[PDB]
Amino acid sequence: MGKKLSLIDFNEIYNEENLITRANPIENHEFSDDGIYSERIFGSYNEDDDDKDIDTIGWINIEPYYIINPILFTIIKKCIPSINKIINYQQSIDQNGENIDLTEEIGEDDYIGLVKFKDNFDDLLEKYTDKKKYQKEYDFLIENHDKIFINKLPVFSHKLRPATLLTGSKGKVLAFDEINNYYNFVIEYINQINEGVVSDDSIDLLLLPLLYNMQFYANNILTRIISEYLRGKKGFLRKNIMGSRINFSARNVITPLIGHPIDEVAMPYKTFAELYKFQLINLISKVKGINYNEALKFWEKGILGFNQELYNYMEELITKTKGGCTFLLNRNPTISIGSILYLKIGLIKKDYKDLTLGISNNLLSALSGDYDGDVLNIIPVFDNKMKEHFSLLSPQNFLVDRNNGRFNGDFDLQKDQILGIFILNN
Amino acid sequence: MISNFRKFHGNKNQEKFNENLILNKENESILNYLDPICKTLEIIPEITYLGSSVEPINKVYKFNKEEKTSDIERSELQLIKMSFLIEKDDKKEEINKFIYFPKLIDSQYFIINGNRYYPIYQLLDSGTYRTNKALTLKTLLMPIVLREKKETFDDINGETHTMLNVDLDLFKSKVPFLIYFFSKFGFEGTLEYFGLQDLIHVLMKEDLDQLDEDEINDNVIFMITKNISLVVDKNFFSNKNNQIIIATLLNCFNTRIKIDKIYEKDYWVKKLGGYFTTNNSNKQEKGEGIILSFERILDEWTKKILRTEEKNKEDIYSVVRWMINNYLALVKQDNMNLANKRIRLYEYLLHPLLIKFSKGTYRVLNNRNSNKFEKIKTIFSNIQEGFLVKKIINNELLRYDNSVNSISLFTLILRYTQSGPQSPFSSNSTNNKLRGLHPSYLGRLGLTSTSAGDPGASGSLTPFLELPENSYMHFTEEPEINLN
Amino acid sequence: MDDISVIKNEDYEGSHRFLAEELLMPNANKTDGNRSTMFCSHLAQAVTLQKAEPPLVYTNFENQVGKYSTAGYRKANSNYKVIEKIYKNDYNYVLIVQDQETGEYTLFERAECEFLTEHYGFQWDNDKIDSLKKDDTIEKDTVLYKNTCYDENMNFGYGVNLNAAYFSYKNETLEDAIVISESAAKKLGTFSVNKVKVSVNTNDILLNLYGDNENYKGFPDIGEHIKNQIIASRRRFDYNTALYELKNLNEMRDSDTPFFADGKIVDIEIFSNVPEEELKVQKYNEQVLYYINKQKEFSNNVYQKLKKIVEGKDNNVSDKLLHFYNNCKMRIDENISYTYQNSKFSGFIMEFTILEEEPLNKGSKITGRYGNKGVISKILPDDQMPTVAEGRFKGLKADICLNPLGVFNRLNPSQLIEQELNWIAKFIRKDMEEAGSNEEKVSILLDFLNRVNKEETELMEEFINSLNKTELEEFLNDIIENGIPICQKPFFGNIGLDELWELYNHYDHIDYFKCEGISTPLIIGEIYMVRLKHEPHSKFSARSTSFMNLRGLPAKSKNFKEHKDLYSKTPVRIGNMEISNLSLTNEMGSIMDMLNSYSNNETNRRELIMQLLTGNPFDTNIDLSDVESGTSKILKSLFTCLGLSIDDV
Amino acid sequence: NEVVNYFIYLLNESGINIQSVHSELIIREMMKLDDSDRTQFKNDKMPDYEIFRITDANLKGDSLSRSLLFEQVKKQLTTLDYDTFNKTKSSILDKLL
Amino acid sequence: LKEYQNYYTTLLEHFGYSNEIKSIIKDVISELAIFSGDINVTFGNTVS
Amino acid sequence: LRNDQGNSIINECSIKQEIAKIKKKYNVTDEVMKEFINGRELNSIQIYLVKIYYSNKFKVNSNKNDIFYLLYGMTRELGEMNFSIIPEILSCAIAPNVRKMNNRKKLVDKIIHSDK
Amino acid sequence: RGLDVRSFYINALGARKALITNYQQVRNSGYLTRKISMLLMDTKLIDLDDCGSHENNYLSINVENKDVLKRFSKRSYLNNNGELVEIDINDESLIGQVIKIPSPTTCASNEGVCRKCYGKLFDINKDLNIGMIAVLLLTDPLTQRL
DNA sequence: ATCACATATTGGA
DNA sequence: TCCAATATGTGATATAATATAGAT
Ligand SMILES: [Zn+2]
C-alpha cells in the first residue's frame, strides 16, 4: 500500500559478469561482447535463444577512484556553492616551471580537486551549508552519507538504446542515440586512468581534470535519461506507464443505424473478423473437425471475400456468447462523460465493402460527436468478469445524470427525433 | 451543342488570369541567386570568386564495360559548375566544384528520387520590419536588430527629459551603435559622418564658465562629469529622432573619462571589446575582429533587395545611419502590409549551401597557428554533387506532392506559406497576428485559403495578381513610407 | 479598426481580383466565410470522377481553372510531326516527334492511368494520341491525352450534377448525412491506382497463383485482373524444408508472404540483378524472364531507331528524349547493375501499376460547392425514395436527399439558390418541349436567361443566330433533356432575393412538388456534388496480434505501406485522459488486466491467446498470472540507472 | 467560505450548470491540511489548512504516483523542493506503475 | 416536450432505480425514436 | 520489429491437440511413452521424418518430449498401414559416427526407372 | 440579399479568428482536464452516516439568488431547532439568507467522504468514481461553451 | 519561444 | 547603505492524421 522513492546502493547489486571493459563498441566488424552493445550481457535484438530480459543492467567500474552520485549532485550544489570550481583542478606554472598561481584571487577551498573534495567533504559541508535555506538538504545529505560517493555506474539495456549496424555502399553506418556516446566516453576515461599505476605519483594535471570531465559526463547521462527517456509525451512515464498501445483494437467510421436498441450496434465484416479471430478459429476447429492451423487457413480465405460460412460462424458467436460479444467505444478526445461507452454487437454486416460502425443516433450527444467522418476507437472486451466490471460504462448507468440524480438529456431525443415527436403530439 | 456555348462563353470572358504569374517559376534562374552565396566566401582574402555557370547537359551515353550502376529511382536534375581561385604564398590553385540542383518539370514541378516535389513561394518582409521595441533588417546569415530603451536624463538646470537610447544586439551583446561608429571613424569622424560636428560639442567646465549667456540660451547642456560637459543645439534637441542620438551618446560616456580618452579611438575599440569579453589585454584585438565581423554582416543580395537610395547602401555603416536617422518613421510601419513584403522561391533552396560555407569560413577565420591553405582546402573538401539535393529533401524545404486530384492551380501553383527558412512565423502564440488577414491583402492574397491544420501559415495567391516587372518579385514597386 | 477604411467598394466594382479559390463557388457573395474556407479545402480534398460533368449552374471561370492547371491535359506547344511510335505494352507506348518550326526532337509517352500518391490517381483518354500514326501532324494546340474531368470541348467539371431534395429520411439524415440512390451512386464513382513493389530474392520463389498445370504464372499478365486480392506470394526456399514445402507450389501455406492489391494491371517493370541464364533455367520465374526480354526488346528498338537522331551532330534532341535514350541504352548495355535505396539488391524487384474503379460506399464523404459536407448514410434503391406523382413531372425521383434542419444556421444560402434556379429551369425546359416552334423555344429560353443573367442572354442570342438550323435543333433538344446552363457569377451578376421574388411572381404556375406518401410538398433541383478523399477505407484499422516492438510492446509496422497486409493493423493508444475516463469504473484490477494482457505483460498475452484459441468459444473466462509487467521492468531498470528504486511501503 | 461563493457566482455568470457538491470536492482536493489529518475537523474550530493551485496540489501532495506521472519529473527527482522522498500515500494509479 | 424528461425522472424514482426500469427507459427511447423517424419520412420537413 | 506471436501460438496449440489425440487414441500412459523413449537420443533423420509426416498439419516444436510423443503416434499410425521398416527406423537410435551410404548406381537408376 | 467586398473582408477575418480559436483550444482543453482529473482521481466514498464533523465546522454559503439555491440539491442544512434537515429547492424562504451546510470540504473521515457530506446523491453515484464524475461535469460544459 | 521560476547588478531612494 | 526594480538568465515544454534520409 503506497509507493516510496528510495535511494539504492549499487554495491549490493553489482555483478562482475555484467562488466563492460571496451569503450569501442565495434570489434572485427561485429558488436563487441565487452562493449555497451554486448550481446552476452544485454541480449540479442532478434534472437530468442539469447533469452536476456530488458531488466538486465550493466556496470562500469571506476575503481579505485570515486565520483559524486549525480542524482544527489544538484542538492549538494545548493549546500556548497561553486562546487564546480572546487572539483575542477587548475594550476599555472612559471617559465622555470614553479607553480605561480599564488592563490591571490581564489579561495583556498576552490580548485583542490575531486579527491581532495571527498577527503575534505565534511568540513567543507559545514563551511558552506546555510541552515536558513538548506537545513533540510543538509539533513538529507547526513542521512544518506553512504550514497553520496559511488565508484560504479549503471548502464541500461541496449534494447532501450537503439543501435543499428546498417550497411552503405560508400561506407557502413552506425545509428545510435546520443546517450551511448556519453556512456562510451566514461569507459574510455576510466581506462586511461586505470592503465597508469594509481600508487605511483603522477602529475595532477593529467589525472584530476579527467575525473572532473567524467563527473560532467555522468551528470549529462542522468540529465539526458530524464529529459529523453523518462519525461513528456515521448517519455516512458506518460506514453507507456499510464497509457499504452493496445492489441485487439480497431478504428472505424460511424454511420446512423435504425430500428435497433440503443446499446446494440452493427459491426463490419473485417473488423469483427480480425478482432474476434481466435474465437472464430476455435469454433471452426470444433465445427469442421480440423486442426487449428487449417482453421487459420479457412479464416485467411474468408477474410479476402465474403464467405457465408464465416458470417454464419460470426452470427453464431454473436448470439451464443454469454456477455454478448461486447466492446468499448471511445471518441477522442475523451474530455467528457460518455465518451467511452460499453456497447454490444448485434449484427455483422453482410457487405465486405461496407466498413462503417452502425451506431444509434441517441448515442451521439454522450460521445459529444457528430457524423463528420471522424474515426472512433473500438476495444473488444472478452473476459466475462471484465464485462460485468465495465458494464458500469453501459448506457443504462449513464441514463441517470450524476449531477442532479435525474434523467440524462444526452440520451434523450435528438433534434430531428424531437421534430418528429413534436409534429406527432403538437 | 451545350459544350460549344460553354467554350464560347469561357473564351469571351473579360476577366482573365495572368499567364506570366502562373509560369513565374520558369522566370527564376539559379545562377543569379547562387552568385551572392558563393561571393560570401570572399571574406577570406585569398579566395577569389571566378564564377558559376551550368555545365552542359548534352552528354550522351557510350557503350562501356565499366560495370556502371544506375538507381531504380529516377531523378531529373541539372549540374552547376562553381569556379573559385585560391592563392596562398604566391601558390595559386583553381578549384571547380559541381552541385546537382532540381530541374523544372512541367513548368511547375521537380522529380527527385522517384517522388514528385513541388516548390512553394515563401512570403517574407522586404526590410526594416518592426518588432516589440526593435527594428530588424534580415541579412543572409546574421540579422541586424536595433533595440530601443526609454531613458531619463536630467538637464543641468535640473529639468529631466525622456529620450530613447538605441543599441545593437549583434554577437549576443547589447552594444550602442555609437560604439561601433566610434571604433570605425572616431568620435569626431562619427559626428562628421552624421554631419553633426557643428551641432554637438564637448567642452571643459572652465570653458563653460567662459561661455556667454546667449549661447546657453541657444543650447542645451548636459554635464558628463563635473570636469567635462556636452552641449547640443536646441533646434537639434527639438526633434525626438535626433534625441535618440543624444541619448545613445549619453549612455556611451562613462563617469570615469578624459577628453583625450574621448579623442582616443582605441578607447572606443577597447570599450567594445570589453562589452564582448572581459580580458583587458586582448580587448583591442577583440574589438578589431568585431568590427571586421560587422563589416561582413552585410551581403550584396541584401543591398540589392533594399529599396533605399544606393547612397545608403554603400556599406553597413551607411545602412545603420539610414536606420537611426529615420528610426522613428521606420519603426512606425505595418509588419503585415504587403508593400513591405515580397515572395521568394529559389532563394530558400540555396540556404543549406550558405550554412555550409559559413561554417567553413568561420573555421578558417578562427584558425590559429596552422596552414591557412589547409583550412581553405577543408572548406571545399566534402562538397559533393548530391549535397544540395539531399539537404533540400531531408530538411523538408521542398513539399511533396500530396495532391488528390488533377487540379493543381490552387493546391500547388499559387500556394504561399509563411513558414520556411528564415521563418518570421512559428507555432508560438504571439505570432497570431501573422495568421490573421490584412486589408492590403485584398486583390493579392486569397482570404479563405488558409489550412485548418495550421491557420494563417498557408494560403493561395490570387490569379489576377500582377507583380511589378523587374521589381525583385516584391508586391509593390515602392514601400509603404516614402520619406517625404 | 479604421485600417479596413482603406477598402473602397467603388474600386472593386465589376472586379473579381480579390477572389481566388472562391471563384469556383457560385453566389460566393451569399455564403459565409467558414463555409467558403471549407470549400477551399474541399477543392483539394476532391477526387477525379469517371463521369465528370460540366456544372449546370456555373461561374464561367471554371474552364480557365481547368486550362491553367496543367496536370490534367497535355498540349503540344509547337507544331510537331510524328517521327515514330514504339510499344512497351499495349497500354503504354512512346511517340518520338519533331518540331516543324524549331527542328528540335521531343518525346510524348502514353499510359492508361497516372498515379499521384498513395492510392490516388486517374485514368486517361488517350484517343487523340492513339489516332496519331507515323508521319502525322500535331497542331499548335492539341489535347494529346486528357483526364476525365475535361469533356470533348475542354469544358472543366470537378463533380457531377445531382437532383437533390431537403428531406428527413427515417432519421438517417441526422446531423448531416446523405442518402443517395443507386443510379446517382453510379455517377459518383472514382479511380484508384496503386504502385505496389514486390521484391524477390534467390531465397524466395513465386507461387503459381495464376494459370494451370501447363502454364506457371505467379502474377497477372498486363490485361488480366487481380483474383483473390493477391498480386503474388513468395516462399523462402531451404534444402531442409524443400521436400515437403515446395510440393504443391500452387496452393498457399502459412509460411508464405502474400501481397495484397485489387484492380487491373496496366504496367509491370522488373529490374533484375540475377544472371539471365539462371532465370532461363528457373521455371517458376519464366514470366519474369518474358517481361525482362520484352523491356530489353523495347529498349533495343528505341536504340536502333533513335541512334541516328541522338548521335547526329547537326541535330537537336530534347533533354527528356536524351535521358530516355540514355536510360534504355544503359539497360541494354552489359554489366548494368540496379540499386534500390543505394544498395545492390539480390534477385529482382517488380513494380506493378494497378487500376480499379471504386464506387460510392457508406461512410464516403460527398459535398457541394458551399461547404455542405455530408457522409453517405444509406445507399438505397432508387424506387424506395421520394417520387412525384402529380403534374407533368410525374415519375421524377430524387437522386440525393439532404438534411433540412440547420440549413439556415449553416449560413450557406447559395445551396438553396442553386436548387431553386435549377428547379425553375425544369419548368422552363418543359415549357420549351411543349412548344412546336423553334422560335418559340428560343424566345422562352432568352426570356428566362434575361431574367437571370443578361450577359448570358446576349451571348446565347449570338450563339443561336450563328448556328445552323440543324445545329440549333440539336442545341434545343439537348437543352430540353440534359438541362439548361445558368450562370451565377460569384460576386457580381448573382441572383439575389428580389430577382428570385420577381421570377417567382412572374411564373405563377410553378409550385412545390407533391411526392408519393409525403405530406409536405417539397422542392427537387439539381445541385453540384463533389467527392471528398476521406472514406471508410482511409482510416480503417483492425489489429489482433501484430509485430511487437524491440521493447516487447505493440507498435505499428510498414506492412500496409508495402502492401503486405490488407488492413492497417495499427494499434490504438489508450491516452491518459482515456485512463481517467475508464477510472469511472472503480475496478482498477480489470483495467490493469486489460492493459497487461493486451500490451504490458507477455505471459498474460500468451495466456489470453491460449484461452481464446482453445476452450469454450461462447463462454470465455480467463485466469491471469501476477508476473511483473515488462513496462514495470523497463521502469525499474531506468530508475536503477538513475539511482532511485520505487518500493512499496 | 469565499472561494466557494466566488465559484458559484462565476458558474452562474458562465451559465455552467454543475451542482456545488462536485465543485466542493474539486476545491477540497486543492487544499492541504497542515496537520494532514481529517480527524482535526471533528474538533471545535476549523484546523490549519492552506489552499493550493491544481498544479501545486499534487506536486506538493503526498502521493508519489500522481506526482511522478504528471508534471516536472526533473525537479521532483533531482531536488527535494516537493519533498518527493517523504511521500508515502497510496493511489489507484500506483497499480499502473 | 420539455416535461418528458421529468416523467422519466419520476419513473426512476417510482420503481426505486431498478435495473429493469432503466432497461424499460432505454426501450421506450428506442421505440419513440423509431416512430419519430417514421413521422419524419411520412410527414416531410423541408427548407426553401 | 520482431516476429508476431499469435501464429506461433496457433501452431503450438495444434501440436498439443495432436499429442492429446495420440494419447486418447491408443490409451497411452506416461509409462508406455517411457518405454518407447527409454534411453533415446535425438536423431536428425528421425526429426526430418516426423516433419515429413505432419508437414500438412503443423510445424514441429522445439521440446524433445513433444517430438517423441509425435514419434510414437506416427509409429502406431504407420504400423496400422502396411508400412513396416519406417516405424522400426523410428524406434531404434542412430549411431554417433554416422556414415553416409556410398552412391549405389544400380539402386539409384532402378529408382529413377520406377513408376512411383 | 447579398454582400459587399468590405463586408466580405470582415466575414473572412471573423472566420480566420474562429479557426485560430479552435486550434488553440484544442491544445488548452486537454491540459486543463488532465490536471483536474489527475488531482481528483483518488476521491472516495464510505458508507458511514455520521463522520463526527463539528456542526460549527460546517461551512456557510450565501443564498444570494435562485441559481445558488439550484446548485444545492439533495443537500442538508441545519434548521433553527438544531437538527439536520434536507434542503428543498422549491422553498424560497431560504433566499436572502446565509445558511451553514454540511460540506465535503469539512468531512472529518480520512477513509472517504461520509453519507452526510456528499448528500443523498451518494447512493446514486456510489457505483462510479466520484472525483472523475466531478471533473468531467466541470470540464465538458466549460470547454464546449468557450 | 511562452510562460513560470531563480539570481546579478544598478539606479534609485 | 541598502533595496526594490530591472534585467538576465534558467528551466519546463509543447499537436494530429505523416513524404524521408567529417597524407604515404
Ligand atoms: Zn463527513
Residue numbers in the entry:
A (entry chain d): 1 to 426
B (entry chain c): 1 to 484
C (entry chain C): 1 to 649
D (entry chain D): 535 to 631
E (entry chain D): 99 to 146
F (entry chain A): 291 to 406
G (entry chain D): 244 to 389
Q: Which sentences did the original study use to describe this structure?
A:
Here, we explain the mechanism by which the phage AR9 non-virion RNAP (nvRNAP), a bacterial RNAP homolog, recognizes the −10 element of its deoxyuridine-containing promoter in the template strand. The AR9 sigma-like subunit, the nvRNAP enzyme core, and the template strand together form two nucleotide base-accepting pockets whose shapes dictate the requirement for the conserved deoxyuridines. The catalytically active AR9 nvRNAP core enzyme consists of four proteins that, when pairwise concatenated, show about 20% sequence identity and cover the entire lengths of the universally conserved β and β′ subunits of bacterial RNAPs. Promoter-specific transcription is performed by a five-subunit holoenzyme that, in addition to the nvRNAP core, contains the product of AR9 gene 226 (gp226).
The structure of the promoter complex has been determined by both X-ray crystallography and cryo-EM to resolutions of 3.38 and 3.80 Å, respectively. In the most populous class of the cryo-EM reconstruction and in both available crystal forms of the AR9 nvRNAP promoter complex (i.e., AR9 nvRNAP-Pro-cryoEM and AR9 nvRNAP-Pro-Xray), the enzyme bound not one but two copies of the P077 promoter-containing forked oligonucleotide—the downstream copy (as designed) and (fortuitously) the upstream one—resulting in a superstructure that resembles the complete transcription bubble found in open complexes formed by other RNAPs. Moreover, in crystallo the nvRNAP molecules and the oligonucleotides formed a train in which the upstream and downstream oligonucleotides belonging to two neighboring unit cells pi-stacked and formed a continuous double helix. The structure of the −10-like 3′-−11UUGU−8-5′ template strand promoter motif is fully resolved in the electron density map of the AR9 nvRNAP-Pro-Xray dataset. In this pocket, the −10U base is wedged between the side chains of gp226 I207 and βN gp105 R363, forming a stacking interaction with the latter. Most importantly, the C5 atom of the −10U pyrimidine ring is only 3.9 Å away from the Cβ of V206, suggesting that a C5 position methyl group would clash with the V206 side chain.
